[PDB]
Amino acid sequence: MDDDLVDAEGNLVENGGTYYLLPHIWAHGGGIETAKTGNEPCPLTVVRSPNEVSKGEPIRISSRLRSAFIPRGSLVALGFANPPSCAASPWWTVVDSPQGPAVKLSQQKLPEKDILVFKFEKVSHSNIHVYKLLYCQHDEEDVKCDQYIGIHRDRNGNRRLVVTEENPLELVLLKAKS
């Protein structure tokens, strides 16, 4: 059977490894990067590449647990293998935004529970492993988390990752190499 996270090539995901977050479509954006938006002195904003031919930034996927893999439904922290030189760390986390809850990097050392707020979900496109991206702090087994990360294109064209009730991300995981 299959019940651990699986990459774009059919191999179990290495817990803590770098896998690119790529799209399930073509001419609609590239991999996932950063962007300096508003008044951040550096790209603290996580957005989708405006370059259809890019794999984006190589992201780290950790369960912050002692497993070689990452079980389905488990929470994970996603973070830049080579993050902006101005963040307390490379891990992503959510903060309130007038565009709704935005995914960003922080100039603050964050307590675990602020970064391990992500979870993947099986899109039923069968033959390749496509996942949606959930944001859950308040977690588990009494209530289902249903806060999907969508995209928000601001006036300056940035495809910002926030929590939207529409056009939610659907991704595939490509293992980064040397």
Helix percent reads under 10%
Please name the CATH architecture.
Trefoil
Count of distinct structural domains: 1
Number of helices, where a helix is a run of at least 4 consecutive DSSP H or I residues: 0
Q: What is the level 1 CATH name?
A: Mainly Beta
Strand content: 25-35%
**SS class:** mainly beta
Number of strands: 12
Shape: globular
Report, as a whole number of angstroms, the end-to-end distance. 31 Å
Q: Can you tell me the CATH topology?
A: Trefoil (Acidic Fibroblast Growth Factor, subunit A)
Quaternary structure annotation: monomer
How many strands, what sense, and barrel or not for the largest sheet?
6 strands, antiparallel
Order of helices and strands: EEEEEEEEEEEE
Please compute the radius of gyration using only Cα atoms: 15 Å
Question: Could you explain the architecture of this structure?
Answer:
- There is one protein chain.
- The chain starts with 17 loop residues before the first strand and ends with a strand.
- It has a single domain, classed as Trefoil (Acidic Fibroblast Growth Factor, subunit A) (Trefoil).
- The protein is globular and about 50 Å long.
- It has strands at residues 18-23, 32-35, 45-48, 58-62, 75-80, 93-95, 102-104, 118-122, 131-135, 149-153, 159-163, 171-175.
- It has no helices and 12 strands.
- With 178 residues, it is mainly β.
- Disulfide bonds join 42-86, 136-145.
- This is Chymotrypsin inhibitor 3.
- It comes from Psophocarpus tetragonolobus.
- Keywords: Disulfide bond, Protease inhibitor, Serine protease inhibitor, Signal.
- Belongs to the protease inhibitor I3 (leguminous Kunitz-type inhibitor) family.
